[PDB]
Design a protein around this nucleic acid. Structure first.
Length: 49
DNA sequence: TAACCGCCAAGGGGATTACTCCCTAGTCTCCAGGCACGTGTTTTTTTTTTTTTTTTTTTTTTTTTTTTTCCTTTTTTTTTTTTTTTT
């Protein structure tokens, strides 16, 4: 479960980086609650279990 | 201290004259090795076919039967409608 947490945390950081990179090039700010997709870790753990 | 010079003495052999003789210069005449020409048979090069190991590819993995579980996409870009602001 630690290894799955590593993989899902890396995927979550990649998605957060993608979101803030596509919302940083226009000069505007971003929302931290809208930045994190909460379904990724829960969906991955549910599928792998 | 003996080179050098002067003086004297002795002898040895190269120069000279003559006689001889014998070996080569010259001239035919026969014939045979020396040389010009042709070429070879080994030597190197090139192909040719095989050999031998390595590497890669491909195919395979006893049969029958009965229950669940999860999934049978998903984000990402483009479009299209809606709403708000301005003159």
């Amino acid at each position: 479960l630690a290894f799955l947490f590593r993989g899902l945390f890396k995927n979550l950081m990649k998605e957060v980086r993608m979101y803030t990179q596509k919302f940083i090039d226009r000069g505007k700010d971003f929302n931290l609650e809208l930045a994190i997709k909460t379904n990724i870790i829960t969906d991955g753990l549910r599928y792998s279990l």
